């Protein structure tokens, strides 16, 4: 596999502050293709200046030809909290509505939706008046809505959308799922699905495929990031209502962090493994986790694979030239092509200040990590567009540059693959 073309666009000037608010590992999602268009969301500085930001949403046509980006500015909600948790997630349901949830660290939900199904009935002009106001609840559902952190969306097969998040705090919290019906426009509460025990689960993502929902996590004892332990897994056949472990054993509802039956790899505290890194269900139904640790004696990214025969394996991702990350370094992602043969590691490198794109293949049991491409000049937790890669074989990555304000830009990089 090779690259046919590399293209990039600058979509904004990143915001100033001592935290990164754009390009954060748990944005789910920042960059989405739906129908014939690609969408992106990010903060930009408002006219009041430093510590005042607005959410922006971009769109461009990508099929059957690629058109120019255009942006709207949601100038009715001012983001002011310089806390690296306070990112934006976007989702697009099968009625065409665009959902946003943003700006949380242990506070009530902030959510808004488009008035109309603007990703389905595509409007000529792209303006902020396409969005309804910020609200602090999910119409049709019920709380708790606070203290919330980490909103994550997952589109289901019938057009519906899940929204998942933590209620509680680092070191003591639970997670909940809500489901939006594209047919009725109402939310419903699926309830608490994982319950902490003087700790909290930190999931890596949500991955839905062919009727099954997959997640993986580590458990955090305290607000100190050295107190993560374990790599855990579960899946659901009913979009989050009921859950099973890797051996198909039904779990209690909610899943307790104290239930060791979901553990797939023992990783002690102090292993330099970070929470909320990456996961992937590939199109063949193999599940993958990206984490890191120091347990070999060197810091390395780690690939966990749930193999078709059921066994889990763990392999370091150590292609030539990749500098392995420590606990606080930017987090990566795993992407997959349509065929399920190609696994992409989208791995920020802390020494190079760049994002590496590496590929491994299912034929070689994913052991054949090779450098495929690079995005230079990043200080980001890279995020990609699943649907665009499946539909057109283009790996599209949203990144925050490295460098100083106001030189540091937000970009989208497209790698057209010779798939
Ligand atoms: C429910 O699922 C869990 C989680 O997957 C599963 O537990 C895992 O079982 C496997 C298989 O027994 C364990 O892996 C082995 O552990 C022993 C040590 O106790 C090792 O000796 C093994 O390594 C040898 O065998 C490997 C075979 O490929 C060789 O490759 C290797 O080089 C060694 O010769 C092997 O690693 C694994 O530790 C657990 N995991 C956890 C987290 O407990 C459990 O069995 C499932 N239960 C049911 C009833 O299905
Ligand atoms: Ca997802
Ligand atoms: Na705790």
Author numbering: 1 to 419
Q: What's the paper's own text on this?
A:
In this study, GA-specific l-rhamnose-α-1,4-d-glucuronate lyase from the fungus Fusarium oxysporum 12S (FoRham1) was cloned and characterized. The results described previously indicated that FoRham1 was an l-rhamnose-α-1,4-d-glucuronic acid lyase.
The structures of FoRham1 WT (ligand-free form), the reaction product (Rha) complex, and the complex with its substrate (Rha–GlcA) were determined at resolutions of 1.05, 1.4, and 2.42 Å, respectively. WT FoRham1 was labeled with selenomethionine (FoRham1 SeMet), and the structure was resolved via the single-wavelength anomalous dispersion method using the selenium atom. The crystals contained one protein molecule in an asymmetric unit. Electron densities of the C-terminal 6× histidine and c-Myc tags were not observed for the WT protein structures and not modeled. N-glycosylation at Asn377 was not observed. In the crystal structure, an electron density peak of Ca2+ ion was found in the interior of the β-propeller fold near the posterior side, but no metal ion peaks were observed in the catalytic site of the anterior side.
